[PDB]
């Protein structure tokens, strides 16, 4: 009955927002990650790291504000406020990209806190920990994309900047430089996200269209009671419908809901793996057979060769402004261009 | 194109001629499919989290459900008791019909917008 | 010496067979292009 | 086309070996019942 047990008691009180031991890590880090993003997008420039404006204060709107990555010259510096780059100066820290590492690291530790919170609450309530396990997927995506990826490249400069448009630029970068759409790990991710969305829509509609008449109202929501023991829709009629429409249907409710966990979690894990490879420029950029043929046979053309021309345009047309530290000067005469355009 | 790389060609050229990424209806399509995948995982994990013990550890828990049984196979009050504490009480469903309508509505509506 | 008491039968039902073969075949269909390169 | 010759055996064992594994487990499941 010492201080540890007393504090345990207090952390685990049932209240409007549960705290728990996990809350000591989660709440500071989540709030700081969030606060750093709102602070930076509202007030802080990217002029000295990127040559970009990036705050409401500067004229940007919700789509174009960002907390941008630090300058390529910082390497993988933690960019601690008290570190050797900013030397304790908050203003310079902001101008040097410090809010980026601040948000990424506090966000990382906040993600850990949230998954610990899932464990903690599930243990106190007596349920199995599969929600925590499912959340490993967004963790894997975050760390692979925001941490592992720029750690394999030259600096944090090439991580995603935290903004709507800045993420759009990240996508396009990955098309042109990494040919990421050609990567089977992304493809598996796509299947998993689209497949998850499909499962979500098809399961909700099946339930809502195989309901039992359990009340007299035309609003069928009222005829459900959370403590009833009886299934609220007919698995049997749902199974018949889908067997006759599609050939196959679910017949096991447990398998159905596990499968709903499995599909998007697996897809996200697969994409994380591909991004790890791209950390090293280990791309699925080319098909060698196609290039050998096309080099020799100028009449051979495929959608694969057409997309590489697009990549080549993306790179040459965006590199000087997207990578200002390189001082790329491409005269007009070297820019690849088709006829007229 | 009716092809995998042809699909990519299509979406690249669409971005150059239209900028689909800066278009709010595409942004809602992303919210529809990302949120769709999210809620797929959530629902799957919450139901799977609250399966009622019906089996031994040497057998698939899936054998605790029999096609056509009248009783529910998980405890929705336990799931709600977990998720409402994960967030707060009123961000969690206690009505399975509203829950599954929401599952249906979010991705359908987001994909309407993106189409 | 007694026989080992920890032994257990293993199972794979027909639906799991169909699901696994589909997984394998679709994966091969996806990766074969990259193996031939 | 000048493809990797080993892609064929790679693809063949990638299909064959896990498929055989499943079939073995399936058939011995039926003959219990």
């Amino acid at each position: 009955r010492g201080w540890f047990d007393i504090l345990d008691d207090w952390l685990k009180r049932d209240r409007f927002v549960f705290v728990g031991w996990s809350g000591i890590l989660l709440f500071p880090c989540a709030y700081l990650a969030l606060g750093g993003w709102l602070t930076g997008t509202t007030f802080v420039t990217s002029w000295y790291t990127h040559g970009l404006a990036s705050s409401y204060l500067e004229g940007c709107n919700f789509l174009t504000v960002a907390v941008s990555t630090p300058a390529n010259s910082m390497g993988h510096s933690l960019l601690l406020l008290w570190g050797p780059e900013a030397q304790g100066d908050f203003t310079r820290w902001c101008q040097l990209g410090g809010l980026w590492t601040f948000i990424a690291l506090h966000g990382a530790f906040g993600l850990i806190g949230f998954m610990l919170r899932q464990f903690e609450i599930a243990r106190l309530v007596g349920v199995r920990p599969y929600n925590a396990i499912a959340f490993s997927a967004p963790i894997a995506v975050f760390v692979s994309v925001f941490l592992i990826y720029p750690l394999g490249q030259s600096s944090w400069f090439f991580a995603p900047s935290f903004g709507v448009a800045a993420i759009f630029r990240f996508l396009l970068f990955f098309q042109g430089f990494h040919n990421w759409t050609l990567n089977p790990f992304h493809m598996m991710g796509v299947a998993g996200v689209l497949g998850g969305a499909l499962l979500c829509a098809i399961h909700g509609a099946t339930v809502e269209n195989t309901l039992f008449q359990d009340g007299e109202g035309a609003s069928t929501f009222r005829a459900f009671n959370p403590t009833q023991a009886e299934e609220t829709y007919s698995m049997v009629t749902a199974n018949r419908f889908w067997s006759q429409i599609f050939g196959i249907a679910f017949s096991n409710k447990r398998w159905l809901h596990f499968f709903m966990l499995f599909v998007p979690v697996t897809g996200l894990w697969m994409s994380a793996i591909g991004v790890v490879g791209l950390a090293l420029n280990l791309r699925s950029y080319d098909f060698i057979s196609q290039e050998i043929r096309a080099a020799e046979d100028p009449e051979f053309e495929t959608f694969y060769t057409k997309n590489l021309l697009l990549n080549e345009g993306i790179r040459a047309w965006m590199a000087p402004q997207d990578q200002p530290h390189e001082n790329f000067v491409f005269p007009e005469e070297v820019l690849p261009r088709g006829n007229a355009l | 194109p009716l092809g995998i790389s042809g699909t990519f060609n299509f979406m690249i050229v669409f971005q150059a001629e239209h900028n689909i990424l800066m278009h709010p209806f595409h942004q809602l399509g992303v919210a529809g499919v990302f949120g769709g995948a999210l809620f797929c995982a959530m629902h799957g994990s919450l139901v799977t989290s609250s399966l009622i013990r019906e089996t031994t550890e040497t057998e698939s828990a899936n054998y605790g459900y029999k096609f056509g049984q009248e009783e529910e196979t998980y405890n929705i009050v336990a799931a709600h008791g977990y998720f409402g504490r994960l967030i707060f009480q009123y961000a969690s469903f206690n009505n399975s019909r509203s829950l599954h309508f929401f599952l249906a509505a979010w991705p359908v509506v987001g994909v309407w917008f993106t189409a | 010496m007694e026989p080992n008491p920890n032994r257990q039968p293993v199972e794979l039902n027909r639906t799991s067979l169909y699901l696994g073969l589909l997984l394998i075949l679709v994966l091969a269909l996806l990766f074969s292009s990259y193996f031939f390169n | 086309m000048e493809v990797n010759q080993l892609g064929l055996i790679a693809t063949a064992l990638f299909v064959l070996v896990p498929s055989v594994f499943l079939i073995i487990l399936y058939v011995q499941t039926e003959s219990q019942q």
Partner: peptide
């Protein structure tokens, strides 16, 4: 040889669809 391989896998999948639909384990009530 690559063409033969691609088409072989595709045809095996179609064949699997056939068994999965017409030779499924029947769902049986309780």
């Amino acid at each position: 040889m690559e063409t033969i391989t691609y088409v072989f896998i595709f045809a095996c999948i179609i064949a699997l669809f056939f068994f999965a639909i017409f030779f499924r384990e029947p769902p049986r009530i309780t």
